[PDB]
Amino acid sequence: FSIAVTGATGQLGGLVIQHLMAAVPASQIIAIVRNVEKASTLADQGVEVRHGDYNQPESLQKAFAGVSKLLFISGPHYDNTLLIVQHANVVKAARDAGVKHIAYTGYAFAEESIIPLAHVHLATEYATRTTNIPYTFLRNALYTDFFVNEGLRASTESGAIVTNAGSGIVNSVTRNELALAAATVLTEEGHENKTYNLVSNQPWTFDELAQILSEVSGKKVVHQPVSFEEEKNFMVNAGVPEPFAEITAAIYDAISKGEASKTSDDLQKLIGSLTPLKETVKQAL
Amino acid sequence: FSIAVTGATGQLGGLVIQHLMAAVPASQIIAIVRNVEKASTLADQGVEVRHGDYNQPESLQKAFAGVSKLLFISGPHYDNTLLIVQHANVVKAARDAGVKHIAYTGYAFAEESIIPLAHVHLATEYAIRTTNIPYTFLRNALYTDFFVNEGLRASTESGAIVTNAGSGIVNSVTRNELALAAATVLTEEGHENKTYNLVSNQPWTFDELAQILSEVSGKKVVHQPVSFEEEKNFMVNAGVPEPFAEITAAIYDAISKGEASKTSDDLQKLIGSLTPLKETVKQAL
Amino acid sequence: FSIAVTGATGQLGGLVIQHLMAAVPASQIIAIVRNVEKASTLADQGVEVRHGDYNQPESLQKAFAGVSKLLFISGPHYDNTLLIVQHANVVKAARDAGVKHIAYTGYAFAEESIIPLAHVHLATEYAIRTTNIPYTFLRNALYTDFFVNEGLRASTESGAIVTNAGSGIVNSVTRNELALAAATVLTEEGHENKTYNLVSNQPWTFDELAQILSEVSGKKVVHQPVSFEEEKNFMVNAGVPEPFAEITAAIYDAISKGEASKTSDDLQKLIGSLTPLKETVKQAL
Amino acid sequence: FSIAVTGATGQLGGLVIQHLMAAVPASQIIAIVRNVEKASTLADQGVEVRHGDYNQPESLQKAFAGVSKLLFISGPHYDNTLLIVQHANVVKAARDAGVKHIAYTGYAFAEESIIPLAHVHLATEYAIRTTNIPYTFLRNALYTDFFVNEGLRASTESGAIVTNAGSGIVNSVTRNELALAAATVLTEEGHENKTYNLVSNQPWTFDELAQILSEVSGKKVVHQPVSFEEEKNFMVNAGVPEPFAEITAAIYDAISKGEASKTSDDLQKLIGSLTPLKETVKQAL
């Protein structure tokens, strides 16, 4: 037997393996990585480490060989068309190695989405289907870790959380809750050919965040929403690179449209109760 | 200015170019092909031939350089998962080359389909959506030529068309007509970002095919619905390849389940009058 | 007589050409780049720009034709093993073209190093040795500009420089200084068959950096050493893309282990007095 | 499971394979060769034969597919810079194919050597280090048969062995014994990440070779040591093309400087006692 995790030294990937070794011996987990030495700490724990590179098809056969269950995590690249080619090659290699279950990290409510990245994941889910391998589509929400972290200290002393998200509702969940979801699916039965939209059923807004921030800190914080340009400017003024700031402005702009505003019980049915936003604020200070 | 056609030595591609020449000078037509000598007959008519193979990304970069409009004819291979890699290569190369308009031969009513190939077409559509290049999804019906061909001669004096298509309905159109649709779209305004389900609004049954056979030919020909392993017999036990005989038997089976039973006016609004079934039966004899 | 520079649009390469232009007529400098159209401003000023791609032996035969002295700037790729293949191609093309002197940007104190990238540079240095072409191994330190850049405003504002570098010593020097060294070696005599460890003889630590950033800015800034995992999580979470956060953390991890802690006089002897840390910080602001 | 041997058609690799057959079933041995039909004799023995060509990356991907242990025998060419390219391709295909263990035939005490080939081997060792595959560096001595061969008839006839090796001591080893070492390392545990300097612990001089040649031939033979330039002239006059004359003269010159004068017990500990020089002389004639 054998469970493989791509993106293993990535943030989601790493957590899946940590959660995985609660349920299975490390000798049953395979970490697939493009620079093996940077996974040395996982090799130390007995997890087998393999070289795999979405960008080099010639690398994948040996990465997937003999594996029963594959956690296929989408590539971090932001060239969407490129992502298609990469994923398509991952899927073909998984097919040829004779993998028995593919779990894929896609996008929640992708059929309704207003963003080209949704089409990447949709294309990939269809790619996985041609394969005939039993599948699980793990359509992860945005990470809460992204908005709830160190950086909110600035907002504490500034008095403001600045975004371009307007009154947008956010269905985000912690990276850790999503990782546990993945790990659960890989280690118990009944998830074959299932599509899960893994989001919060207790959504929030940035006025809420400002408000919870005020309570758990002590200083008042308001949410000052602004334009796409003004927010890209805000972060630039404070040392964040322009491409990185396009991304963050991208995420917020999407939020303001309804992109993170649909909910589901899928994740809660899977992992039990979610971590409240307030507790996640505390586990950040 | 230039219009390119992949698959240009195959039956559909070949017919598209013929229609295209009725509308625009040959110097405006680029034929893209796996074998460049096996198309000299196209070069004689003054049509620019270029080499392009879907397994070779670099071949496609060069093949697509400078094209305004691309007719991306779907790949013929039997390995669906391969086809996804190929199609993703083609899509990336068109994006890279700055193609201004992309038309793709997909599959009619693909979302409701029970045929694996449909997942290929859907993945490819999503990959195309990804590039933001104006697109026309030419969702082609099954070919009428597939059922109405040389092999009806062999049914005639025998006295029976033998299929496992049960009593299912068929909305097939000829390659010629679909080629006209393709050529028509490349050739006039107003087809950008459109999805057309290109089928017949005069469907027919296999029992009806028999009647039309008798009507035109010598004697009594009947339909003879069989099992679908029983069909492999009247095929594999008569000198036919075992993957190919499977392909056909799984089409009939889909047909017996209503795969080809739904219709649309899209094609007729695009090209006008459709070719009566009886016409095509004569023509294939 | 020709001096060619690879990576001439990259940051080191560009500055080398600036310096070469101060010492020789433009008609004697050749720029080698992946994208010649983007380097057109060099051509406007009279610098021949030639296409060179390390994966492409044929591209390099033409880039290197008739060149007297070559500055071979090492590849940016992340695949160390591909990097050896690429560098081997460069070397063999330089040999075949009868290049009369090769300068190569390697890695200081590589024999002592604990980082796979060091093996690439040593392999490359041996490859060059095989050609018998007189050589100069310009073994460059990490760039000061990687740590001291306007990105430090983030730390000014937040009151902390967060690294996983611990109290590791940093022997970095500026890009400009290395570029100057490269240009000096190509335009004067007495550097043939020499190896130079081009690092600082006045190294610093992040605690020092934090103290200088204090004095310069006005605000209080401390250094905050965290774990490898903590740093990755900190950046990924602050908008930094995961492959790039991985690079920064690895660099930091190396520094903490003494990877940048050895010093030398080589650079100072080549170019004169070095720029103080204080000055680059003022400069970054 | 499997062990593959490159250069499987050369002398060293052919020897290795004969040895490996004393140890494993023939089905377990893959012979990788430039010309498959030219290796029918091996096929006959039950050894799997695969096409592999150091100049063709694609061949090596397919050749190394699924192999556990690879013995990578260095290229026989005398163009050192080409060797680097060829070697780098082998290293990358091995890396890509996930070979589990790579043994490489380098050159004993390479870092101390003054002869050109040593740089090739050094470069290859570094390339292999970058792949992170468990390795064995089989650093071979000069081959005994480079000096002790059929060409020694010239010296019996002439009365003299003419070299420019002066009084240099020689630690060379027969190819057969180096092949047995390789076979041993590949069929037993404990050689992962090891470097062996595989030389003789019973070295010899040319004066001695001369005296053994007199015992065996019954005719008086003396060593006549001469200068570098005289050896080149001697050989060219014997018909040896000048490029191979350089190579030979440079080997002897190096011997006269102590290059083959250090010994190690690595080989003896690996295979037992060595073949006496006298036996090799009798066998050569």
Would you tell me how many other CB atoms lie within 10 Å of the CB of residue A136?
Answer: 22
Classify D170 as helix, strand or coil. Answer: strand
Would you tell me how many other CB atoms lie within 10 Å of the CB of residue C59?
Answer: 18
Options 3.40.50.1860, 3.40.50.620, 3.90.25.10, 3.40.50.920; which CATH number does D140-174+198-262+272-285 get? 3.90.25.10
Taking CB atoms and an 8 Å limit, are D98 and A56 in contact across chains? Answer: no
- At which residue do the structure tokens 């296409």 appear? C51
Residue spans of the domains in chain B: they are: 1-139+175-197+263-271, 140-174+198-262+272-285
Q: How far apart are CA C160 and CA C181, in angstroms?
A: 34
Name the residue in chain C with its Cα closest to that of A55. C79
Which A-chain residues 244-263 have CB contacts (< 8 A) with chain C? Answer: 244-245, 247-248
CA distance between the termini of chain D: 41
Which approach determined this entry? X-ray
Amino acid at C237: N
Q: What is the DSSP letter of A35?
A: S
Phi, psi of B194 (to 5 degrees): -120, 145
Closest listed residue to residue A247, CA positions, set C237, C229, C158 = C237
- Tell me the DSSP string of D20-52: HHHHS-GGGEEEEES-SGGGHHHHHHT-EEEE-
Taking CB atoms and an 8 Å limit, are C88 and D92 in contact across chains? Answer: no
**Which of C84, C85, C114, C193 to probe the D interface (max D CBs under 10 A)?**
C84
- Tell me the DSSP string of A165-187: -TT--B--B-HHHHHHHHHHHHT
Of A88, A119, A132, the CB nearest to B85: A88
* CB burial readout A98-135, b (16+ within 10 A) else e: ebebbbbbbbbbbeebebebbbbbbbbbbbbbbbebeb
Q: How far apart are CA B84 and CA A128, in angstroms?
A: 10
Q: Which residues of A touch C229 (CB under 8 A)?
A: 14
How many helices (H) does chain C have, and how many strands (E)? 12, 9
Q: What is the DSSP letter of D233?
A: H
Q: How far apart are CA B210 and CA D160, in angstroms?
A: 98
- At which residue do the structure tokens 């190929």 appear? B86
Q: How big is the A-C interface in CB pairs under 8 Å?
A: 57
Q: Which two tokens stand for residue A253?
A: 């702009």
**Which chains, if any, share at least 3 CB pairs under 8 A with chain D?**
A, C
Q: Which two tokens stand for residue C79?
A: 């695949």
Taking CB atoms and an 8 Å limit, are C120 and D126 in contact across chains? Answer: yes
Phi, psi of D172 (to 5 degrees): -65, 165
Establish whether C82 is an annotated binding residue.
Answer: no
Strands B160-161 and B222-223: parallel
Continuous H helices in A53-151: 60-64, 80-96, 116-129
Name the residue in chain D with its Cα closest to that of A38. D132
Nominal resolution (angstroms): 2.5
Q: How far apart are CA B225 and CA B255, in angstroms?
A: 12
For residue A121, the Cα-to-chain-centroid distance in whole angstroms is 13
**Which chains, if any, share at least 3 CB pairs under 8 A with chain A?**
B, C, D
Classify D199 as helix, strand or coil. Answer: coil
Of A37, A56, A63, the CB nearest to D132: A37
Of C78, C154, C232, the CB nearest to A240: C154
Q: How far apart are CA D209 and CA D212, in angstroms?
A: 5
Please give the CATH number for the structural domain made up of B1-139+175-197+263-271: 3.40.50.720
Q: Which residues of A touch D98 (CB under 8 A)?
A: 50-51, 61-63, 65
User: Which residues does residue B223 pair with via DSSP β-bridges, in sequence order?
Assistant: B161
What's the gap in Å between the CA of D226 and the closest CA on chain C?
A: 26
Phi, psi of C132 (to 5 degrees): 70, 5
- At which residue do the structure tokens 């010159």 appear? D253
Would you tell me how many other CB atoms lie within 10 Å of the CB of residue B153?
Answer: 12
Rounded to whole angstroms, what are the CA distances from A223 to A130, A151, C53?
Answer: 46, 14, 50
Phi, psi of A70 (to 5 degrees): -110, 125
Q: Are A76 and C241 in contact (CB under 8 A)?
A: yes
Of D61, D66, D95, the CB nearest to A51: D95
Q: Which two tokens stand for residue A47?
A: 């997890």
Q: Is residue C194 within a helix (H) or strand (E), and if so which, with residue range? A: strand C194-198
